[PDB]
């Protein structure tokens, strides 16, 4: 059981909310590189921890991420002119650089120019995404390759969808092996075991766990191990396939919205391209998603669930495996009332995720280094994996690296 | 630097909100005359200071302005039948006249005489239906507004129902700095984009100048553009060589506003309604919907053309008012002035800020609300623009409104 | 100078039109292998040479291509039930197989020989290079299915963009044998640089020249012709020529100059006199060639954004192919997006069948004039017993191929010994 | 086998076509009563045999049917003012009455004798079982209007579904007189049998032909057959084997060479026969869901008649909903005039062959001065009906004494 209290604590990220402050202790993806386009390109809107952000790429190709509302009278910078090494607001011609310095003010003589600085965040570009450090400046750590993007020879293919529900349930969905055998029946293996035994192993960055199913052959002394990795506060590394690995990173746009990024990543000639990935997942922009990466599926059209399809044997009658997830997640409401839950042994990873985060948030709201920073970070040596193993090797012992070649 | 409380005091108008009661002391435009139509024409729904209203023209051709909801069981009168000197509710057949007197009650037999429905005194003028919405015994006699001398003048109005609070919209009216950037590609013999700002308080608001350096002779000359603020939310805008310009805003509620943009002057030099609308791109059925709501909106980024912008045009948006609309709206439903960062160009905005708070505070504690009485403006108050010698004061400049 | 006759002859394929009969001597791409889907999958409608076709994959996973209309009372088969080794009509239960045998008639007392006497027009089908092919010539004129010049064998990635263009085939192909246009029409797409090839990243194809007026040369051959466009390069055009060799494989295949990583082809299949299946292909090594979806997004021939369910283009004359007039003021040359979409806007506005009578060609057009002579010759010879052009021992194969290079002026482009871009080659 | 010539003759009805002249000898449904509305009600466009038509009910409530273009300068009368006992053209105010008399010309000093001088093409009309009928053949060949075989008298409920179909009339009737199809196409809708292969018989009459479909009954198959009897009343009526509670009827009127108005009727005792709206919902031929304002269907070739491919994989045979639409799909996809020349028929089409032969003869006969099939002494009467029962093979089905389902 959790309390309406702890639900609030684990879930809210807007404003003062602890989990928010804690989260901003990490680098965050603000948006996709493909959105910001060429030098001097169209400014893009984005949103993290309930703060509206412009992202533009100035003429020097530097990417800037700032408070959307211009420092003068609070008009939007998204309508601005990106040229000549700066974003210039439409109303009264103030022009900020990616750093947030105001280079000019077409309407003003004195020296207000030097002495006004606009909320701008240090940015970093990696693995097809635009990252920003959204917590206190002199706490920003240097940028390390995240677990699912070792270095820049790796192919990283991103699906992005802006989902209208709180982040926590979207992740709870990722560390739940039981469900692929149920939701993803008709989509997703050497085993037909529907009830996996679950084992956890706490770590410095989050945790590891295993789904132990009875394999199709020699269920006698063999186990089929599928092992997911939760990297706090909002990453999951999903059990890989024959050829590439799969990761989920979720960025809370606010209390009830979350940017959801589902990644394929491996050796470039074993890994799908971006546009292939999305077609598979049915998150293709303009067929599946609007121009903002908002799903055309929703409660109204019952996520295009096809009832005939279902009677024909197709399990969910919803096409694209994440869309199937979406259907479930979003019907749990804005913020899922964990208060009303009725968990079983299958939700072991889930109960770890709540315990761990509730832990690392109160701790943090009290002066502990926030879970997963400093000496402790996960790196590209931690990774999910799936194999068949003897019942007599520990799965934690298994010496797996991320799939490649 | 303003407090949150002041912004709330300056800005709110629904219910008892002081700025509300203050405004209701002036005559207020409720809607356009075009909307009301012929005698016995279709009822119009309109909204002022967070109160819903019917407007209908009866058989005699009297226009009324009443509470939208029937005095029986609060059904919408907008659905009623406007005929034979009354508006009759569909439901039970009660029939009010423009004055709010209940003439009949189809479904009942001395009640018909002793029930009044809220109606306000009304006046047509300059193509608008005006009402008085303050206490009945405070109603002035209707004087011409400073932008409609008498109705041999041509008054061509664009209306747009903007979904944001009233004040930020006027704030944009009194801001001569903005057109030097925003209306970069629409707007004058100068390119001084940073003009010295001068102000002069009055009994009815303020006059103010914007002192640009002219294309030639900015040794002993200033190009001066002067703008007049009539409280509570009216602004006389520097005219051009042919006709003058005015903006009056009526708060619909705390987060919405009727925005009337007016060209005015002599009928042979002032453009016609539809020409105006087409110019400012505020045409019903292309730029706006049947209720004068803009089809442009944040969802569609006001139809900004990003290529147009790479091709020289500053804003990418078409129709100088919509480029205004973009800014006003993006600041949010009520602009949080708390978080502002004003400069020398915003001197005019500050004056309004400061004057109106004085006025509302003064009024709240029982002063006559600013603009009433002896203190009124009338047609001789006006904006102007000319090249003025540096050795003359502009407050001195003796200018009347463009005509012939 | 061409004549109303010669045009009609060159262009029409419906009916007993010879250019039709000639064409049917080749294997024809009927539709995309992706359209037919799974065994017992929904049946696809298609159209070649003025004939309606059902294509389906049976329960054994065989692909049949047949006449669309049911042998019985001519109802559409595309509505029928594909199951248990056949396609069955909804009306009277007749069930054909991939071959054209009516294996059942549910209405008809099977106590008579009605079922074995009825044969329904089908064609021998083949699957290859991501496409379903059929032989729509006379039955025992059918050659063993040879690897096409742009799909060597099956270790090769082949990414296809399909677009059903609503004009005649011949203008579309004329488009592919025309190096001059790319320097005018595809100004803002094939942007000149200090390179040697034309990489991209959905960035741009490059090209080491800015010469818009290339010297043209031709070489007739058994299967059609090759030609070269000779551009002065940016650097040392003294004794160097940037060669770009396009190959025409008759009747309607264009081998287009490769870039750095992969090769480019075009194959057009006339649906009828005034419409044309246009397939535009990237092909080469699996790890250097774009995946299907990636290709389409670059070309803006994505189904459900650029094209509709049936691979028909959403851009048309009405919407002026989405011509962004602003973009044109701001620099982008055509103001239309996805470079084959630029081609289309032209080909289309020349009308259902270009009236080649009123043309006014230059030395830019030398390659097109070459296609016009050849095809009119080969069709005339064919109408008089001559083995249809590019069949038998005379066919192209995977050793014919386009190429680009800077070559010294004192080598003959015909002499250059090139192979299709692979990984090293 | 049939010939391009004959097909033409069977099918075309516009202009001078012989099948046109023959058809114009019978009373014709022009459109539903439900359309012409109250007196002074909005004028209705309609189209029979390639002639455009205005229908309107005047102040007295008489229903006129006229040529659509105003007699003056040929503007549409469908835009006209229907009041004060006349339809008045909007242009120059010429006003006609149902009978095609011009009562005034609002811009002419009509005080003399070129206001009566002008009649306007207008046909005699009758209201009956939900339908405005007109006789559009030559004046003096009009037979006094006898009750058709599916509406015995106006104490019957007659529930109609109308559908404007974009193909020639003939393939739409062929569809009605073809029992072979109900046990294949309508397999998941449509009986004490599972037999799909039934021995047909045909008997010609003066009005058309009767025939019997014979299925072996699910039980006692040795000396009993389940008889389904359909009656073709020419030119394009079909009486279709009834059910337990009501009878069925198809009449098709050619709008022209490549379109038909398809009227499909439920009829019987008022308390055993569906209401209009029920029928339409059952057949999915409801105006405003399935059909547009003009009874034109929203399912078409472009949207594959809403064929649900999954539903089919699920085992519902056609994956099209409402059994008439299963039919439409087939008929249309054959194309505007089925080229009967590429037909390859079998035993199951025995009836359709009868239809072909009869009509081809009856029109060559008509063209050479014989009476038009099933007119005068020859006509069908409400004594003619479709029937189905289980009968011994030792009664002649032709002889069976069945009457129309009622109670
Ligand atoms: O038909 C086409 O789309 C096409 C033809 C030629 C070339 C070229 O030679 O670069 C490119 C594209
Ligand atoms: S508000 Fe952005 S410059 Fe004035
Ligand atoms: S509420 Fe309007 S009369 Fe009853
Ligand atoms: S037409 Fe296909 S079986 Fe009757
Ligand atoms: S055409 Fe009808 S009256 Fe002139
Ligand atoms: Fe999932
Ligand atoms: Fe403005
Ligand atoms: Fe091209
Ligand atoms: Fe049927």
From TrEMBL, chain A:
<feature type="binding site">
    <location>
        <position position="73"/>
    </location>
    <ligand>
        <name>[2Fe-2S] cluster</name>
    </ligand>
</feature>
<feature type="binding site">
    <location>
        <position position="93"/>
    </location>
    <ligand>
        <name>[2Fe-2S] cluster</name>
    </ligand>
</feature>
<dbReference type="InterPro" id="IPR050584">
    <property type="entry name" value="Cholesterol_7-desaturase"/>
</dbReference>
<dbReference type="GO" id="GO:0016491">
    <property type="term" value="F:oxidoreductase activity"/>
</dbReference>
<feature type="binding site">
    <location>
        <position position="72"/>
    </location>
    <ligand>
        <name>[2Fe-2S] cluster</name>
    </ligand>
</feature>
<dbReference type="InterPro" id="IPR036922">
    <property type="entry name" value="Rieske_2Fe-2S_sf"/>
</dbReference>
<dbReference type="Pfam" id="PF00355">
    <property type="entry name" value="Rieske"/>
</dbReference>
<keyword id="KW-0001">2Fe-2S</keyword>
<dbReference type="InterPro" id="IPR017941">
    <property type="entry name" value="Rieske_2Fe-2S"/>
</dbReference>
<keyword id="KW-0408">Iron</keyword>
<protein>
    <submittedName>
        <fullName>Rieske (2Fe-2S) domain protein</fullName>
    </submittedName>
</protein>
<keyword id="KW-0411">Iron-sulfur</keyword>
<feature type="binding site">
    <location>
        <position position="325"/>
    </location>
    <ligand>
        <name>Fe(2+)</name>
    </ligand>
</feature>
<keyword id="KW-0479">Metal-binding</keyword>
<feature type="binding site">
    <location>
        <position position="179"/>
    </location>
    <ligand>
        <name>Fe(2+)</name>
    </ligand>
</feature>
<feature type="binding site">
    <location>
        <position position="184"/>
    </location>
    <ligand>
        <name>Fe(2+)</name>
    </ligand>
</feature>
<feature type="binding site">
    <location>
        <position position="70"/>
    </location>
    <ligand>
        <name>[2Fe-2S] cluster</name>
    </ligand>
</feature>
<dbReference type="InterPro" id="IPR015881">
    <property type="entry name" value="ARHD_Rieske_2Fe_2S"/>
</dbReference>
<feature type="binding site">
    <location>
        <position position="92"/>
    </location>
    <ligand>
        <name>[2Fe-2S] cluster</name>
    </ligand>
</feature>
<dbReference type="GO" id="GO:0005506">
    <property type="term" value="F:iron ion binding"/>
</dbReference>
<dbReference type="InterPro" id="IPR045623">
    <property type="entry name" value="LigXa_C"/>
</dbReference>
<feature type="binding site">
    <location>
        <position position="75"/>
    </location>
    <ligand>
        <name>[2Fe-2S] cluster</name>
    </ligand>
</feature>
<feature type="binding site">
    <location>
        <position position="89"/>
    </location>
    <ligand>
        <name>[2Fe-2S] cluster</name>
    </ligand>
</feature>
<dbReference type="GO" id="GO:0051537">
    <property type="term" value="F:2 iron, 2 sulfur cluster binding"/>
</dbReference>
<keyword id="KW-0560">Oxidoreductase</keyword>
<dbReference type="Pfam" id="PF19301">
    <property type="entry name" value="LigXa_C"/>
</dbReference>
<feature type="binding site">
    <location>
        <position position="94"/>
    </location>
    <ligand>
        <name>[2Fe-2S] cluster</name>
    </ligand>
</feature>
<feature type="domain" description="Rieske">
    <location>
        <begin position="30"/>
        <end position="132"/>
    </location>
</feature>
């Amino acid at each position: 059981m959790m309390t309406h209290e702890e639900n609030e604590l684990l879930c809210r990220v807007e404003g003062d909310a602890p989990m928010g402050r804690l989260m901003r202790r990490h680098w965050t993806p603000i948006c996709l590189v493909e959105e910001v386009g060429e030098p001097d390109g169209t400014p893009v809107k984005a949103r993290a921890f309930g703060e509206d952000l412009v992202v533009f790429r100035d003429s020097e190709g530097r990417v800037g991420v700032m408070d959307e509302y211009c420092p003068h009278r609070r008009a939007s910078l998204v309508y601005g002119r990106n040229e000549e090494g700066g974003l210039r607001c439409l109303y009264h011609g103030w022009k900020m650089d990616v750093d947030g310095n105001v280079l000019e003010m077409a309407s003003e003589p004195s020296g207000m120019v030097d002495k006004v600085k606009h909320t701008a965040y240090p940015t970093q570009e990696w693995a097809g995404m635009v990252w920003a450090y959204m917590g206190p400046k002199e706490t920003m750590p240097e940028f390390l390759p995240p677990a699912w993007a070792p270095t820049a020879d790796t192919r990283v293919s991103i699906a992005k969808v802006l989902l209208p529900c709180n982040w926590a349930q979207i992740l709870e969905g990722a560390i739940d092996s039981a469900h692929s055998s149920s939701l993803h029946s008709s989509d997703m293996r050497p085993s037909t075991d529907k009830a996996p035994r679950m084992q956890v192993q706490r770590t410095g960055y989050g945790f590891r766990y295993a789904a132990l199913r009875r394999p199709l052959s020699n269920a006698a002394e063999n186990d089929y191990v599928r092992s997911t990795v939760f990297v706090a506060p909002a990453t999951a590394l999903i059990p890989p396939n024959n050829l590439y690995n799969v990761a989920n990173i979720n960025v809370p746009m606010d209390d009830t919205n979350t940017a959801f990024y589902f990644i394929a990543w491996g050796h470039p000639s074993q890994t799908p391209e971006t546009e292939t990935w999305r077609k598979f997942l049915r998150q293709t922009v303009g067929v599946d998603l609007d121009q903002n990466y908002r799903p055309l599926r929703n409660e109204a059209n019952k996520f295009w669930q096809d009832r005939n399809a279902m009677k024909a044997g197709n399990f969910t009658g919803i096409t694209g495996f994440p869309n199937q997830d979406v259907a479930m997640w979003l019907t749990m409401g804005p913020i899922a009332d964990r208060t009303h839950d009725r968990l079983g042994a299958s939700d072991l990873a889930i109960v770890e995720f709540r315990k761990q985060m509730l832990d690392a948030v109160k701790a943090f709201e009290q002066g502990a280094p926030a879970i997963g920073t400093g000496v402790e970070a996960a790196t590209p040596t931690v990774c999910s994996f799936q194999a068949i193993v003897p019942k007599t090797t520990d799965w934690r012992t298994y010496d797996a690296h991320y799939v490649w070649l």
